[PDB]
Design a protein around this ligand. Structure first.
Ligand code: H3J
Length: 186
């Protein structure tokens, strides 16, 4: 099936707990995979205009590890629940991808999660202004704009709204798209 095929490709890139104990300032992100109308999509958030770190930007659900978290995957699931109301029975965490190093003292660990078909996002307005889906295949032929820095523009055909996706978030999307969609019969 489409979903079994996805998890099997994703598992070949799992680095597991290899880098998880290093003494960094630690953040996790959830890369939420949704199946809709026969195809895979990623779920994104637009950050509230109120936040100190990066108001108004497109990002994956996530945030800073705290003393309650049993492990880095727990940080990502705690944070997704708080931002968009995703409960634990509604997500299967399939792997841990390569972590992202920033600012000399920070390590961001990405987890890929398969989302239940009956999940419906409840955006928390203190943290997220909007939630939207993008088909995974878009990231193989994106509409690119240069600000030199590469920016993706995605227009939702449901309503004509344009979102800008850039930086680490855009890098991770392309990575997931490659892993899952490369080399497939049609
Ligand atoms: C994650 C998920 C879907 O997408 C969305 C999009 C926006 C808000 N909530 C859910 C869906 O249709 C089935 C599970």
């Amino acid at each position: 099936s489409m979903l079994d095929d996805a998890k099997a490709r994703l598992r070949k890139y799992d680095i597991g707990g290899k880098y998880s104990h290093l003494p960094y300032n630690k953040y996790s992100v959830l890369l939420p995979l949704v199946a809709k109308e026969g195809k895979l999509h990623l779920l994104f958030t637009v950050r509230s205009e109120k936040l100190r770190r990066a108001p108004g930007e497109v990002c994956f659900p996530g945030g800073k590890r705290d003393p309650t978290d049993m492990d880095d995957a727990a940080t990502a699931l705690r944070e997704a629940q708080e931002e968009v109301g995703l409960r634990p029975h509604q997500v299967e965490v399939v792997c841990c991808l390569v972590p992202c190093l920033i600012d000399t003292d920070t390590l961001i660990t990405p987890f890929v999660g398969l989302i239940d078909h009956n999940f419906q996002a409840q955006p928390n307005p203190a943290e997220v202004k909007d939630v939207f889906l993008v088909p995974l295949a878009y990231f193989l032929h994106p509409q690119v704009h240069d600000q030199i820095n590469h920016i993706f523009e995605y227009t939702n055909p449901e309503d004509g709204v344009t979102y800008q996706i850039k930086g680490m978030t855009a890098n991770l999307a392309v990575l997931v798209a490659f892993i899952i969609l490369e080399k497939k019969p049609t």
